[PDB]
């Protein structure tokens, strides 16, 4: 049993809810929250900007030190950093950004990072300002992630379309 509430069950391991991931993280304090990161861990907008704002910029300060030591992530890659006030850990995952021309086949590689964690609160990778089709992102998630994933979808209209169209 876990703390996640109000989710629709899509599969054995994937759950979905219309929710603000920031407000959901603050309520649950999950072991892992996933950030929709870029390779520079520059948390300007979208999910990343909202998560970072909720940490009072402490996520960005920690991230800048990580990049100064390690250099940029790979598209499809990830790193584990602090979850600050939101979670124990934040898994920063880089999905391909269609608005930069990145290979959508890298979306499966991105979701494979989730399999290193037994339970996660996450957004749909490469959705929103990363430009991919969220219906596609949900299909790749279901077909790639084997651990227990609780998906937060900010937009009510999109949530209802994801559920209605789910095979």
UniProtKB/Swiss-Prot annotation:
Changing residue 31 to A: In strain: Mu/B.1.621. Changing residue 164 to L: In strain: Gamma/P.1. Residues 1-167 form the Macro domain. It is found in: Host endoplasmic reticulum membrane. Coiled coil: none annotated. Inhibited in vitro by GRL-0617. It catalyses: Thiol-dependent hydrolysis of ester, thioester, amide, peptide and isopeptide bonds formed by the C-terminal Gly of ubiquitin (a 76-residue protein attached to proteins as an intracellular targeting signal). It is a multi-pass membrane protein. It comes from the Viruses. May form homohexamers. Interacts with N protein. Responsible for the cleavages located at the N-terminus of the replicase polyprotein. Participates together with nsp4 in the assembly of virally-induced cytoplasmic double-membrane vesicles necessary for viral replication. Antagonizes innate immune induction of type I interferon by blocking the phosphorylation, dimerization and subsequent nuclear translocation of host IRF3. Also prevents host NF-kappa-B signaling. In addition, PL-PRO possesses a deubiquitinating/deISGylating activity and processes both 'Lys-48'- and 'Lys-63'-linked polyubiquitin chains from cellular substrates. This is Papain-like protease nsp3. The gene is rep. The chain holds residues 1025 to 1191 of 7096 of the full protein.
């Amino acid at each position: 049993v876990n703390s996640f509430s109000g989710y629709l069950k899509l599969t054995d391991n994937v759950y979905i809810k219309n929710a603000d991931i920031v407000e959901e993280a603050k309520k649950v304090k999950p072991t892992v929250v996933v950030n929709a990161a870029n390779v520079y861990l520059k948390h300007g907008g979208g999910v990343a900007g909202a998560l970072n704002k909720a940490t009072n910029n402490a996520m960005q300060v920690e991230s800048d030190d990580y990049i100064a030591t390690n250099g940029p992530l790979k598209v499809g890659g990830s790193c584990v950093l602090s979850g600050h006030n939101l979670a124990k850990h934040c898994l920063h995952v880089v999905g391909p950004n269609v608005n930069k021309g990145e290979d959508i086949q890298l979306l499966k590689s991105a979701y494979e990072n989730f399999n290193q964690h037994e339970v996660l609160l996450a957004p749909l990778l490469s959705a929103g300002i990363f430009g991919a089709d969220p219906i596609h992102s949900l299909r790749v998630c279901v077909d790639t992630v084997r651990t227990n994933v609780y998906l937060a979808v900010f937009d009510k209209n999109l949530y209802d379309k994801l559920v209605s169209s789910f095979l």
